[PDB]
Design a protein around this ligand. Structure first.
Ligand SMILES: [Mg+2]
Ligand SMILES: [Mg+2]
Ligand SMILES: [Mg+2]
Ligand SMILES: [Mg+2]
Ligand SMILES: [Mg+2]
Ligand SMILES: [Mg+2]
Ligand SMILES: [Mg+2]
Ligand SMILES: [Mg+2]
Ligand SMILES: [Mg+2]
Ligand SMILES: [Mg+2]
Ligand SMILES: [Mg+2]
Ligand SMILES: [Mg+2]
Ligand SMILES: [Mg+2]
Ligand SMILES: [Mg+2]
Ligand SMILES: [Mg+2]
Ligand SMILES: [Mg+2]
Ligand SMILES: [Mg+2]
Ligand SMILES: [Mg+2]
Ligand SMILES: [Mg+2]
Ligand SMILES: [Mg+2]
Ligand SMILES: [Mg+2]
Ligand SMILES: [Mg+2]
Ligand SMILES: [Mg+2]
Ligand SMILES: [Mg+2]
Ligand SMILES: [Mg+2]
Ligand SMILES: [Mg+2]
Ligand SMILES: [Mg+2]
Ligand SMILES: [Mg+2]
Ligand SMILES: [Mg+2]
Ligand SMILES: [Mg+2]
Ligand SMILES: [Mg+2]
Ligand SMILES: [Mg+2]
Ligand SMILES: [Mg+2]
Ligand SMILES: [Mg+2]
Ligand SMILES: [Mg+2]
Ligand SMILES: [Mg+2]
Ligand SMILES: [Mg+2]
Ligand SMILES: [Mg+2]
Ligand SMILES: [Mg+2]
Ligand SMILES: [Mg+2]
Ligand SMILES: [Mg+2]
Ligand SMILES: [Mg+2]
Ligand SMILES: [Mg+2]
Ligand SMILES: [Mg+2]
Ligand SMILES: [Mg+2]
Ligand SMILES: [Mg+2]
Ligand SMILES: [Mg+2]
Ligand SMILES: [Mg+2]
Ligand SMILES: [Mg+2]
Ligand SMILES: [Mg+2]
Ligand SMILES: [Mg+2]
Ligand SMILES: [Mg+2]
Ligand SMILES: [Mg+2]
Ligand SMILES: [Mg+2]
Ligand SMILES: [Mg+2]
Ligand SMILES: [Mg+2]
Ligand SMILES: [Mg+2]
Ligand SMILES: [Mg+2]
Ligand SMILES: [Mg+2]
Ligand SMILES: [Mg+2]
Ligand SMILES: [Mg+2]
Ligand SMILES: [Mg+2]
Ligand SMILES: [Mg+2]
Ligand SMILES: [Mg+2]
Ligand SMILES: [Mg+2]
Ligand SMILES: [Mg+2]
Ligand SMILES: [Mg+2]
Ligand SMILES: [Mg+2]
Ligand SMILES: [Mg+2]
Ligand SMILES: [Mg+2]
Ligand SMILES: [Mg+2]
Ligand SMILES: [Mg+2]
Ligand SMILES: [Mg+2]
Ligand SMILES: [Mg+2]
Ligand SMILES: [Mg+2]
Ligand SMILES: [Mg+2]
Ligand SMILES: [Mg+2]
Ligand SMILES: [Mg+2]
Ligand SMILES: [Mg+2]
Ligand SMILES: [Mg+2]
Ligand SMILES: [Mg+2]
Ligand SMILES: [Mg+2]
Ligand SMILES: [Mg+2]
Ligand SMILES: [Mg+2]
Ligand SMILES: [Mg+2]
Ligand SMILES: [Mg+2]
Ligand SMILES: [Mg+2]
Ligand SMILES: [Mg+2]
Ligand SMILES: [Mg+2]
Ligand SMILES: [Mg+2]
Ligand SMILES: [Mg+2]
Ligand SMILES: [Mg+2]
Ligand SMILES: [Mg+2]
Ligand SMILES: [Mg+2]
Ligand SMILES: [Mg+2]
Ligand SMILES: [Mg+2]
Ligand SMILES: [Mg+2]
Ligand SMILES: [Mg+2]
Ligand SMILES: [Mg+2]
Ligand SMILES: [Mg+2]
Ligand SMILES: [Mg+2]
Ligand SMILES: [Mg+2]
Ligand SMILES: [Mg+2]
Ligand SMILES: [Mg+2]
Ligand SMILES: [Mg+2]
Ligand SMILES: [Mg+2]
Ligand SMILES: [Mg+2]
Ligand SMILES: [Mg+2]
Ligand SMILES: [Mg+2]
Ligand SMILES: [Mg+2]
Ligand SMILES: [Mg+2]
Ligand SMILES: [Mg+2]
Ligand SMILES: [Mg+2]
Ligand SMILES: [Mg+2]
Ligand SMILES: [Mg+2]
Ligand SMILES: [Mg+2]
Ligand SMILES: [Mg+2]
Ligand SMILES: [Mg+2]
Ligand SMILES: [Mg+2]
Ligand SMILES: [Mg+2]
Ligand SMILES: [Mg+2]
Lengths: 64, 96, 51, 84
RNA sequence: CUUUAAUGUUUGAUGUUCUAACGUUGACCCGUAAUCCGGGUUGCGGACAGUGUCUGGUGGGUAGUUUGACUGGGGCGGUCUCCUCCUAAAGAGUAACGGAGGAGCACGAAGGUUGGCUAAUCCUGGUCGGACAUCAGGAGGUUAGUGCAAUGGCAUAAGCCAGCUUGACUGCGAGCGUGACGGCGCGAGCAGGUGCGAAAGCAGGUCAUAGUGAUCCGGUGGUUCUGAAUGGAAGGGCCAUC
RNA sequence: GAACUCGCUGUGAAGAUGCAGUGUACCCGCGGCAAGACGGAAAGACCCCGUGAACCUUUACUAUAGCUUGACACUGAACAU
RNA sequence: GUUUAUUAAAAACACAGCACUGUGCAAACACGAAAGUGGACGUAUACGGUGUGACGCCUGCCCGGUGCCGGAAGGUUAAUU
RNA sequence: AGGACCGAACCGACUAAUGUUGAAAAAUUAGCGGAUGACUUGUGGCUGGGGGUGAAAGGCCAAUCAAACCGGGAGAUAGCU
RNA sequence: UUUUGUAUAAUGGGUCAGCGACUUAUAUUCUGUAGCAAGGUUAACCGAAUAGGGGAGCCGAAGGGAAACCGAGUCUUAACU
């Protein structure tokens, strides 16, 4: 039968032009008074996935 | 996705966004696919009959891709700034 | 331990605020400072309020 | 068989290493903003075209070659960047 | 507005009496050749008892399960995250139930800037005053002091006193360091708006290195986003925070 | 598993018929004895491990039969507080 | 007297006797989704549960903990409205 | 008269020897306990598996019992050999 | 066979003959090979047709942003060297 997508990985990764993936940074939901503004400002944009992690992401999203 | 017991990558990262229902009834049209209709008038109904866009598309957008070499007429569609120049240089017209 | 979180609310009516801590036992007065408001882009007066 | 397994110890813990030291040595060509040495306190002092961070990190402020020298009435150690 | 009695209205409850629902494992007649059952007559109870739906308490009577790892075998005892020194072999890193100590905070000034200062300890003289309080001189040279452990720093002081203040600021960021990763760290320069200084200039917290908790699920405020026939709204997204 | 199936001292996956050095020993039965072949028999029952099992206990967790409380229905009429 | 048919016959179980407690008869209690049945064609000198164990001399002090029995002025408290 | 006494049939199973690929998947030989009673025996009947029955040993329920046997879910699962 | 390590006195095999363990279906990515190429290819079904019809669909030729939206650019910001 057809492969089934890991539905929780699809809510966290998106594919880009050359075939990479983008994600949202961690550590910005919670406990924000004690963090510096320089630190929180650098966690706001989006980021790419590293080389060692790509194999685990690709297996979870076969139709992406 | 199993990593031995350590919290895996697709769960220690946060979720983001929402999915838009309007984006699924929208399409884009190239310049090179613009003389493939019949009649010389480019329109939402004539693009479906030429198998260029889907049956439930309600909005369309002509972008700058390829070449157009004949005078054509566009009604009811949106056109980019750079595609409006290439159509008018060939001797075309754009109407709302 | 004993310091507890508070917020400073802008007096320009833009709803913008900062956050900090304060021990109420030794300094029961209200804190008041001048800070940059990015909505109107001016230094105005901020005043204390609860979380 | 009889067995005696002793008592316990009240030592046993440490903290993580922090990779201090010299990153670029004398005569190396560096770009502006490069880190030259990491330290606690100023075992080295900042010279020409070199800045000092909030944790006493020394970094380049131009493009050139690293240079070590000793100067002053206290025989102290300085790093400067000589323009490339 | 309150203070009292009833008229009238509203029911809410606690009591006696009644019989017509309902109970009868009291008596008698019939189906009937029958200690079941049904019908009839009478007596005794009587809106109680009992049953259905919903609900608070109790419930090893029964059921499904859980009850960590390290470890000179297991159990008992000790430990599990973070910071500083030694082991560690003069770059970085480096183990043991190896040898010694600390943290789970504090501060609207103990932060910024401008101007100004320099310690411990001992000796001699001096009212109470003494081994040690405050005063004057000499010798000494950081043996002192750092909000809190240890190490590395500090006189141009980072140590000590004053005036004015909110840069403990918003959007970014060339280039580097350290990690398997998630992440953590240093940073000149650019745009907007501030403070101190006559100016050159300094300022994106504190001499530095501990003072900490992912994602999910929700709560509060703001929003040129979305809004299942259409106009709204509910709910969702984005930004700040718990 | 196959055998043309000796002793001693050493060696060696650390207690040798089979390895090294050496000593002794013509070929084959029959009656006896149990020191060795870490002799035969039963994938150690003791001990530890596996995010294995079963049954027992309780003021471990979460449920539930039973027992118990009230509201409404079956369910009506006077009268006084 | 009884007991581990097939490694344990005993000081273990039972026993006559003693005490506590429940039960007014459509009895408590047990087997049953229920209808029914046993208790019993019995009726407190009767029936069920628990402990102790012929007989003789006896059975002391503690109600703070846990459990049970009684009470109902006050506080907290469900469905319902 | 008697859960009285000694002792055969009958019902048991305290000690020793043998046997242990047995004559026998629990026996034989020599002694042993009860033997008118809570005794022993023939034929038929009733109680069914989280169930029965138990003078109680976790004993017995067709050489099987801390949950019988047969068929099915079923090629349960097995980071282990 | 398993191990740091086995002549091992660690495991398995009395011998012979026969049988006895990486498969099948569907989806997805990479490599070789063939066809056609800014295009490639049809499913169910029709049809006596392994032919022929059927282009419903699918992949590719455009990306950025949570999204509205813009578009060889787009997002971030009051604005970017
Ligand atoms: Mg990106
Ligand atoms: Mg948020
Ligand atoms: Mg864990
Ligand atoms: Mg089409
Ligand atoms: Mg010994
Ligand atoms: Mg260290
Ligand atoms: Mg009657
Ligand atoms: Mg009556
Ligand atoms: Mg009732
Ligand atoms: Mg209830
Ligand atoms: Mg239990
Ligand atoms: Mg319980
Ligand atoms: Mg139970
Ligand atoms: Mg159970
Ligand atoms: Mg249980
Ligand atoms: Mg289970
Ligand atoms: Mg263990
Ligand atoms: Mg040992
Ligand atoms: Mg050992
Ligand atoms: Mg141990
Ligand atoms: Mg312990
Ligand atoms: Mg070193
Ligand atoms: Mg070295
Ligand atoms: Mg190494
Ligand atoms: Mg160590
Ligand atoms: Mg300070
Ligand atoms: Mg100064
Ligand atoms: Mg200062
Ligand atoms: Mg000025
Ligand atoms: Mg400090
Ligand atoms: Mg250090
Ligand atoms: Mg949750
Ligand atoms: Mg609408
Ligand atoms: Mg809204
Ligand atoms: Mg020999
Ligand atoms: Mg010999
Ligand atoms: Mg040896
Ligand atoms: Mg041998
Ligand atoms: Mg030997
Ligand atoms: Mg031999
Ligand atoms: Mg030989
Ligand atoms: Mg040999
Ligand atoms: Mg030899
Ligand atoms: Mg040899
Ligand atoms: Mg030899
Ligand atoms: Mg030899
Ligand atoms: Mg030789
Ligand atoms: Mg013989
Ligand atoms: Mg012989
Ligand atoms: Mg013999
Ligand atoms: Mg013999
Ligand atoms: Mg022998
Ligand atoms: Mg031998
Ligand atoms: Mg052996
Ligand atoms: Mg074994
Ligand atoms: Mg075993
Ligand atoms: Mg055991
Ligand atoms: Mg495990
Ligand atoms: Mg007897
Ligand atoms: Mg008997
Ligand atoms: Mg017994
Ligand atoms: Mg026996
Ligand atoms: Mg026997
Ligand atoms: Mg006996
Ligand atoms: Mg016996
Ligand atoms: Mg009955
Ligand atoms: Mg009866
Ligand atoms: Mg007793
Ligand atoms: Mg007596
Ligand atoms: Mg007593
Ligand atoms: Mg009591
Ligand atoms: Mg009492
Ligand atoms: Mg009571
Ligand atoms: Mg007799
Ligand atoms: Mg006798
Ligand atoms: Mg006799
Ligand atoms: Mg018997
Ligand atoms: Mg016997
Ligand atoms: Mg004898
Ligand atoms: Mg015999
Ligand atoms: Mg006999
Ligand atoms: Mg005899
Ligand atoms: Mg006899
Ligand atoms: Mg007798
Ligand atoms: Mg018989
Ligand atoms: Mg008979
Ligand atoms: Mg019979
Ligand atoms: Mg029968
Ligand atoms: Mg029967
Ligand atoms: Mg039966
Ligand atoms: Mg069963
Ligand atoms: Mg049953
Ligand atoms: Mg019996
Ligand atoms: Mg039983
Ligand atoms: Mg027992
Ligand atoms: Mg059978
Ligand atoms: Mg049997
Ligand atoms: Mg079972
Ligand atoms: Mg049983
Ligand atoms: Mg059978
Ligand atoms: Mg079975
Ligand atoms: Mg079965
Ligand atoms: Mg199944
Ligand atoms: Mg199988
Ligand atoms: Mg199997
Ligand atoms: Mg294996
Ligand atoms: Mg094995
Ligand atoms: Mg093995
Ligand atoms: Mg070994
Ligand atoms: Mg060898
Ligand atoms: Mg060999
Ligand atoms: Mg061998
Ligand atoms: Mg051998
Ligand atoms: Mg062995
Ligand atoms: Mg072997
Ligand atoms: Mg082994
Ligand atoms: Mg083997
Ligand atoms: Mg083998
Ligand atoms: Mg063998
Ligand atoms: Mg063969
Ligand atoms: Mg090709």
């Amino acid at each position: 039968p057809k492969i089934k997508t890991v539905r929780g990985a699809a809510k966290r990764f998106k594919k880009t032009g050359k075939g990479g993936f983008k994600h949202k940074h961690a550590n910005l939901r919670h406990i924000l008074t004690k963090k510096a503004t320089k630190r929180k400002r650098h966690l706001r944009p989006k980021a790419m996935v590293s080389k060692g992690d790509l194999g685990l992401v690709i297996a979870c999203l076969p139709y992406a | 996705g199993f990593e031995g017991g350590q919290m895996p990558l697709y769960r220690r990262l946060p979720k983001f966004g929402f999915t838009s229902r309007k984006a699924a009834i929208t399409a884009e049209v190239r310049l090179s696919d613009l003389a493939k209709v019949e009649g010389g008038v480019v329109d939402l109904n004539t693009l479906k009959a030429a198998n260029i866009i889907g049956i439930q598309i309600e909005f369309a957008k002509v972008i700058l891709a390829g070449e157009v070499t004949t005078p054509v007429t566009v009604r009811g569609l949106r056109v980019t700034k750079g595609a409006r120049a290439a159509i008018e240089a060939a001797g075309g017209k754009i109407e709302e | 331990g004993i310091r507890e979180k508070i917020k400073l609310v802008s007096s320009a009516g833009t709803g913008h605020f900062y956050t900090t801590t304060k021990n109420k036992r030794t300094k029961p007065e209200k804190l008041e400072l001048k800070k940059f408001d990015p909505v109107v882009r001016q230094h105005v007066i901020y005043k204390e309020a609860k979380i | 068989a009889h067995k005696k397994a002793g008592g316990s110890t009240r030592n046993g813990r440490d903290s993580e290493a922090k990779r201090l030291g010299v990153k670029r040595f004398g005569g190396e060509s560096v770009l502006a903003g490069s880190i030259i040495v990491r330290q606690r306190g100023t075992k080295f002092h900042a010279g020409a075209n070199v800045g000092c961070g909030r944790d006493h990190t020394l970094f380049a402020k131009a493009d050139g070659k690293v240079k070590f020298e000793v100067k002053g009435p206290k025989n102290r150690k300085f790093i400067s960047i000589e323009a490339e």
